[PDB]
Amino acid sequence: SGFRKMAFPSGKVEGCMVQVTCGTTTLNGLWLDDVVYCPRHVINPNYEDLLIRKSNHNFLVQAGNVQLRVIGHSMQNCVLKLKVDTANPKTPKYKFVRIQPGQTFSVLACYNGSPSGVYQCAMRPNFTIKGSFLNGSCGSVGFNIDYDCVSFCYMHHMELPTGVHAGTDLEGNFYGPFVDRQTAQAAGTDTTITVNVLAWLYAAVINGDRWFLNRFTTTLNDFNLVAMKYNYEPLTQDHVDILGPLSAQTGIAVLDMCASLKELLQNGMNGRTILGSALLEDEFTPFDVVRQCSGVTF
Amino acid sequence: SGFRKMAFPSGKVEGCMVQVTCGTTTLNGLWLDDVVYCPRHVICTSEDMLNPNYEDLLIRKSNHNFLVQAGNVQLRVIGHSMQNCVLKLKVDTANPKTPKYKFVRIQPGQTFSVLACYNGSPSGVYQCAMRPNFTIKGSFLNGSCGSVGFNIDYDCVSFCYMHHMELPTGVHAGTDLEGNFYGPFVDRQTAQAAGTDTTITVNVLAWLYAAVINGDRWFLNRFTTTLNDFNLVAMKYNYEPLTQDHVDILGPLSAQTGIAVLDMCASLKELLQNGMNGRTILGSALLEDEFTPFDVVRQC
Ligand SMILES: O=C(Nc1cncc2ccccc12)[C@@H]1CCSc2ccc(Cl)cc21
């Protein structure tokens, strides 16, 4: 029993964190094989013009107490790739994956190439992450672990004026309509990840919290008309299919749980909590719920 | 900016997790140097869990009865001893991945990271606090016994908890790494219940200071309070008494924000009286109590 916001074990990623210094800017790098990936803002910015002026010895890369020597550099979108002479012996089995809004991942927050914390979060529908980062956290990475394979999905680049964070996939493509420069940028109005709230309501049922259940069901269209009113993302037939295993396990049809959610949105919690929360939690995917309520290991 | 419940990076602990099997029972072990630490109840059978005589069950065991597995490698047990509720299995190989470590016993209100494991394989990491009633509100299933709680400070891993059991309310009980249980619990299947839990007041105050550091001030008020008046009110909401030690501990956060501890106590009293009124503090509609004053200074 119990339901916690759980992150993947970060060990396979800790062995990849390095410090990257260029000029006065120090941030984090991801050392995989003989390449160090880091935000290109380490170099009105014409990044082609800025990178051409830099030589390999301008980038000081530090892996623990060992300085790696840079033997090449190239840019791929908003990520700088520093070719190093040494392949990381701790390189795990990995993939670069781009995630969709609503998908969750673990973030290994780093400062000066040293991991300081690990937390679980979700890519918001507005493409920001509500992370916890300070100055020097740039280059910190988001990931998921599948068996023995680390799927890198995020690299931190900046903080928006509202305190939320913006970054790219490992190929340098930003999540969201953001650019890597000091300019007027704002996160769009956020919405609640509906499929994730439903997954969390199923997790509450699996943990013995049933007070919010009711005899009612709803059509997908009627639920979505309610979801639009409360700034909740539309629930698709794909989401309903994805919730299938949890619906079979608890005996509560997805549209039956949708009527519970509709009543919760119109009436509130009434002083009650669900899994120790007075708000509807949306940072657990259906897969996260199954994984935690079954104990899958890595 | 931002405030998350952050766990320590678990890598230094992952390289210590092993599987320990004794008969039909399989649980997790912590392999540090040439010793594997695990709950002693790994030696318990079916008609043993109610009233086990661990000394009697252990004397009947030999080293080869304990199967220890580190990844795909079976470690050879060359000795065994019991220290309180932990079994110490001497192995023939020192863990090359052993980090700099200490065994520390924590007090209620202290937080730590838990590396939840099944079959010696880490599955997740989360943050939690030792409740005032000595239980932890963890996320543990069958086979998670032997999973450990820890903090990392200056490259040193301080092991503070080892998971042993789940109480009937879904809360968890365990020991420090010397085998001493936290709370009035025993590693027996006899009727045991967690005491009434209370809110960790010093942690709620630390979290209110974290909210102020992050720009949220809506809950502040023009009032102050005496420590005694705060404790009389707080106890009525099942909040732990705030001691002068707690007030001293909150000193640095009080100096940083410019809000005296007793002025923040008056905001807390008012929040307990009024509730949040549809508002949130650091993305939460409840008062968070699993961040210590030290965690707040660390993260903010
Ligand atoms: O509680 C125990 N195991 C578990 C530990 N954490 C989470 C669990 C979730 C679900 C089922 C079992 C879980 C064991 C076996 C049951 S009776 C018992 C009595 C005393 C002692 Cl020390 C251990 C145990």
Coordinates of C-alpha atoms in Angstrom, one line a residue, chain A:
Chain A
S1 CA 0.0 0.0 0.0
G2 CA 0.9 3.6 -0.4
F3 CA 1.1 6.0 -3.4
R4 CA 4.0 8.3 -3.7
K5 CA 5.4 10.5 -6.5
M6 CA 8.1 8.1 -7.5
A7 CA 11.0 8.8 -9.8
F8 CA 13.1 6.2 -11.6
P9 CA 16.3 5.1 -9.9
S10 CA 18.8 7.8 -11.2
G11 CA 22.1 5.8 -11.0
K12 CA 22.4 5.1 -14.8
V13 CA 22.0 8.9 -15.4
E14 CA 24.3 10.0 -12.5
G15 CA 27.3 8.3 -14.3
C16 CA 26.7 10.5 -17.3
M17 CA 26.6 14.0 -15.6
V18 CA 29.5 16.3 -16.3
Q19 CA 30.3 20.0 -15.8
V20 CA 30.7 22.2 -18.9
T21 CA 32.3 25.6 -18.7
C22 CA 32.7 28.0 -21.5
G23 CA 33.8 31.5 -20.6
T24 CA 31.9 32.7 -17.5
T25 CA 29.0 30.2 -18.0
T26 CA 29.0 26.8 -16.2
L27 CA 26.2 24.3 -16.7
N28 CA 25.6 20.5 -16.9
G29 CA 26.4 18.2 -19.7
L30 CA 25.3 14.7 -20.5
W31 CA 28.2 12.4 -21.4
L32 CA 27.1 9.4 -23.5
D33 CA 29.8 7.5 -25.5
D34 CA 32.3 10.1 -26.7
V35 CA 29.9 13.1 -26.9
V36 CA 28.8 15.6 -24.3
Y37 CA 25.4 17.1 -24.9
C38 CA 24.5 20.4 -23.3
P39 CA 22.4 23.6 -23.9
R40 CA 23.8 25.7 -26.8
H41 CA 23.3 28.9 -24.6
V42 CA 26.7 27.9 -22.9
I43 CA 28.5 29.6 -25.9
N44 CA 19.9 38.6 -30.3
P45 CA 22.2 35.5 -30.4
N46 CA 23.4 34.1 -33.7
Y47 CA 24.6 30.7 -32.4
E48 CA 26.3 29.7 -35.7
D49 CA 28.4 33.0 -35.4
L50 CA 29.1 32.4 -31.7
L51 CA 30.1 28.7 -32.1
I52 CA 32.5 29.4 -35.1
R53 CA 34.5 31.8 -32.8
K54 CA 35.0 29.1 -30.2
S55 CA 37.8 26.5 -30.3
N56 CA 37.7 23.0 -28.6
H57 CA 40.0 24.1 -25.8
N58 CA 37.5 26.9 -24.8
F59 CA 35.0 24.3 -23.5
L60 CA 36.3 22.9 -20.2
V61 CA 34.5 19.6 -19.5
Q62 CA 34.9 18.1 -16.1
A63 CA 33.8 14.5 -15.3
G64 CA 34.2 14.3 -11.5
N65 CA 37.8 15.3 -10.7
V66 CA 38.9 14.5 -14.3
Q67 CA 39.0 17.1 -17.1
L68 CA 37.9 15.6 -20.5
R69 CA 39.5 17.0 -23.6
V70 CA 37.1 18.3 -26.3
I71 CA 38.2 17.3 -29.8
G72 CA 35.2 18.6 -31.8
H73 CA 31.9 20.5 -31.5
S74 CA 28.7 20.7 -33.5
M75 CA 25.3 22.1 -32.9
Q76 CA 22.0 20.3 -33.4
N77 CA 19.1 22.6 -32.9
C78 CA 19.3 24.1 -29.3
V79 CA 21.9 21.4 -28.1
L80 CA 25.6 21.7 -28.4
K81 CA 27.4 18.4 -29.0
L82 CA 31.0 18.3 -27.7
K83 CA 33.1 15.5 -29.1
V84 CA 35.4 14.3 -26.3
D85 CA 38.5 12.0 -26.5
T86 CA 37.2 9.5 -24.0
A87 CA 34.1 7.4 -24.3
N88 CA 32.1 7.3 -21.0
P89 CA 32.7 3.9 -19.5
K90 CA 29.5 4.3 -17.5
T91 CA 27.3 4.9 -20.6
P92 CA 24.1 2.9 -20.2
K93 CA 21.9 1.4 -22.9
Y94 CA 20.0 4.6 -24.1
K95 CA 17.7 6.2 -26.6
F96 CA 16.7 9.8 -27.2
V97 CA 12.9 10.0 -27.2
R98 CA 10.6 13.0 -27.6
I99 CA 7.6 12.8 -25.2
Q100 CA 4.1 14.2 -25.6
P101 CA 2.3 16.5 -23.1
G102 CA 0.9 14.5 -20.2
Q103 CA 3.8 12.1 -20.2
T104 CA 5.9 11.9 -17.1
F105 CA 9.6 11.6 -16.5
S106 CA 12.3 11.8 -13.8
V107 CA 14.6 14.8 -13.6
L108 CA 18.0 14.5 -12.2
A109 CA 18.7 18.1 -11.0
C110 CA 22.4 19.0 -11.2
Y111 CA 24.7 21.9 -10.4
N112 CA 28.3 21.9 -11.6
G113 CA 28.0 18.4 -13.1
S114 CA 27.0 17.0 -9.6
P115 CA 23.6 15.4 -9.2
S116 CA 21.8 17.0 -6.2
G117 CA 18.2 15.7 -6.5
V118 CA 15.8 13.5 -8.3
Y119 CA 12.1 14.3 -8.8
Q120 CA 9.2 13.1 -10.9
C121 CA 7.2 15.5 -13.1
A122 CA 5.1 15.7 -16.2
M123 CA 5.3 17.6 -19.4
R124 CA 2.4 20.1 -19.0
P125 CA -0.1 20.5 -21.9
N126 CA 1.4 24.0 -22.3
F127 CA 4.9 22.3 -22.8
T128 CA 6.4 23.6 -19.6
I129 CA 7.4 21.5 -16.6
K130 CA 6.7 22.6 -13.0
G131 CA 10.2 21.7 -11.9
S132 CA 12.6 22.8 -9.2
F133 CA 15.6 24.5 -10.5
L134 CA 18.0 27.3 -9.5
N135 CA 20.9 29.0 -11.4
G136 CA 23.3 26.5 -12.8
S137 CA 20.7 23.7 -13.2
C138 CA 20.8 24.1 -17.1
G139 CA 21.7 20.9 -18.8
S140 CA 19.9 18.8 -16.1
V141 CA 18.0 15.9 -17.8
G142 CA 14.7 14.2 -17.8
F143 CA 14.4 10.5 -18.4
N144 CA 12.5 7.2 -18.2
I145 CA 13.9 3.8 -17.6
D146 CA 12.6 0.8 -19.6
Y147 CA 14.1 -2.5 -18.4
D148 CA 17.9 -1.6 -18.7
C149 CA 17.4 1.3 -21.3
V150 CA 17.4 4.9 -20.3
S151 CA 15.2 7.0 -22.6
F152 CA 16.4 10.6 -22.4
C153 CA 13.5 12.9 -23.1
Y154 CA 14.4 16.4 -21.7
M155 CA 17.2 18.8 -21.1
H156 CA 16.6 21.9 -19.1
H157 CA 17.4 25.2 -20.7
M158 CA 15.5 28.0 -18.9
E159 CA 13.0 29.3 -16.3
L160 CA 10.0 31.4 -17.4
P161 CA 8.8 34.5 -15.4
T162 CA 6.0 32.4 -13.7
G163 CA 8.6 30.0 -12.1
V164 CA 7.9 27.2 -14.6
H165 CA 10.7 25.6 -16.7
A166 CA 11.3 25.1 -20.4
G167 CA 13.7 22.8 -22.3
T168 CA 14.3 20.6 -25.3
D169 CA 14.4 16.9 -26.2
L170 CA 18.0 15.5 -26.6
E171 CA 18.0 16.4 -30.3
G172 CA 17.7 20.2 -29.3
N173 CA 14.1 20.7 -30.3
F174 CA 12.2 22.7 -27.7
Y175 CA 9.1 21.5 -26.0
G176 CA 6.7 24.4 -26.6
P177 CA 6.8 27.7 -28.4
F178 CA 10.0 28.8 -26.6
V179 CA 13.3 30.1 -27.8
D180 CA 16.7 30.0 -26.0
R181 CA 17.2 33.7 -25.3
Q182 CA 16.5 36.5 -22.9
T183 CA 13.2 37.9 -24.3
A184 CA 9.5 38.3 -23.5
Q185 CA 8.3 34.6 -23.3
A186 CA 5.3 33.3 -21.3
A187 CA 3.8 29.9 -20.7
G188 CA 0.4 29.5 -22.3
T189 CA -2.7 28.8 -20.1
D190 CA -2.2 25.4 -18.6
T191 CA -4.8 22.6 -18.5
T192 CA -5.2 19.5 -16.4
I193 CA -4.0 16.2 -17.8
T194 CA -7.4 14.3 -17.7
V195 CA -6.2 10.8 -18.5
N196 CA -3.6 11.2 -15.6
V197 CA -6.3 12.4 -13.1
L198 CA -8.4 9.3 -14.0
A199 CA -5.3 7.0 -13.6
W200 CA -4.7 8.6 -10.1
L201 CA -8.4 8.0 -9.2
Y202 CA -7.9 4.3 -10.2
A203 CA -4.7 4.3 -8.0
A204 CA -6.9 5.7 -5.1
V205 CA -9.4 2.9 -5.6
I206 CA -6.6 0.2 -5.7
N207 CA -5.4 1.8 -2.4
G208 CA -8.9 1.6 -0.7
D209 CA -10.1 5.2 -1.3
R210 CA -13.7 4.7 -2.8
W211 CA -15.7 7.6 -1.4
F212 CA -15.8 9.5 -4.8
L213 CA -17.2 6.6 -6.7
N214 CA -20.9 6.8 -7.7
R215 CA -23.4 4.7 -9.6
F216 CA -23.3 6.9 -12.6
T217 CA -21.7 6.8 -16.0
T218 CA -21.4 9.4 -18.8
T219 CA -20.9 9.6 -22.6
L220 CA -17.4 10.6 -23.8
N221 CA -18.9 13.7 -25.4
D222 CA -20.7 14.8 -22.2
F223 CA -17.6 14.3 -20.2
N224 CA -15.5 16.3 -22.7
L225 CA -18.1 19.2 -22.6
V226 CA -17.5 19.3 -18.8
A227 CA -13.7 18.9 -19.2
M228 CA -13.6 21.9 -21.5
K229 CA -15.4 24.0 -18.9
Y230 CA -12.9 23.2 -16.1
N231 CA -9.7 23.6 -18.1
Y232 CA -9.2 19.9 -18.4
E233 CA -7.6 18.4 -21.5
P234 CA -10.1 16.4 -23.8
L235 CA -10.2 12.7 -23.1
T236 CA -9.8 10.7 -26.3
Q237 CA -10.8 7.1 -27.1
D238 CA -7.1 6.4 -27.0
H239 CA -7.0 7.5 -23.3
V240 CA -10.1 5.3 -22.6
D241 CA -8.3 2.3 -24.2
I242 CA -5.1 3.1 -22.3
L243 CA -7.2 3.1 -19.0
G244 CA -8.6 -0.4 -19.9
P245 CA -6.4 -2.5 -17.7
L246 CA -7.1 -0.3 -14.6
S247 CA -10.8 -0.4 -15.4
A248 CA -10.6 -4.2 -15.5
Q249 CA -8.6 -4.5 -12.3
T250 CA -10.9 -2.2 -10.2
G251 CA -14.2 -3.0 -11.9
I252 CA -14.9 0.6 -12.6
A253 CA -15.5 1.4 -16.3
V254 CA -13.6 4.5 -17.6
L255 CA -16.8 6.4 -18.3
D256 CA -18.0 5.4 -14.8
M257 CA -14.8 6.9 -13.4
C258 CA -15.4 10.0 -15.7
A259 CA -18.8 10.5 -13.9
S260 CA -16.9 10.5 -10.6
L261 CA -14.5 13.1 -12.0
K262 CA -17.4 15.2 -13.3
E263 CA -19.0 15.2 -9.8
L264 CA -15.6 16.1 -8.2
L265 CA -15.2 19.0 -10.6
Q266 CA -18.7 20.4 -10.0
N267 CA -19.0 19.7 -6.3
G268 CA -15.4 19.7 -5.0
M269 CA -13.9 17.3 -2.4
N270 CA -16.0 18.6 0.5
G271 CA -13.2 18.6 3.1
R272 CA -12.2 15.1 2.0
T273 CA -8.9 13.9 0.4
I274 CA -7.9 11.3 -2.2
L275 CA -4.5 9.7 -1.6
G276 CA -3.6 12.4 0.9
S277 CA -4.4 15.2 -1.6
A278 CA -7.1 17.9 -1.5
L279 CA -6.5 18.6 -5.3
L280 CA -6.9 16.2 -8.2
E281 CA -3.4 14.9 -9.1
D282 CA -2.4 14.8 -12.8
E283 CA 1.3 13.9 -12.8
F284 CA 0.8 10.1 -12.8
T285 CA 0.2 8.4 -16.1
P286 CA -1.8 5.2 -16.4
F287 CA 1.5 3.4 -16.9
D288 CA 3.0 5.0 -13.7
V289 CA 0.0 3.7 -11.7
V290 CA 0.3 0.2 -13.0
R291 CA 4.1 0.2 -12.5
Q292 CA 3.8 1.4 -8.9
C293 CA 0.7 -0.8 -8.1
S294 CA 2.6 -4.0 -9.4
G295 CA 6.3 -3.2 -8.5
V296 CA 8.2 -3.3 -11.8
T297 CA 12.0 -3.2 -11.2
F298 CA 15.1 -1.6 -13.1

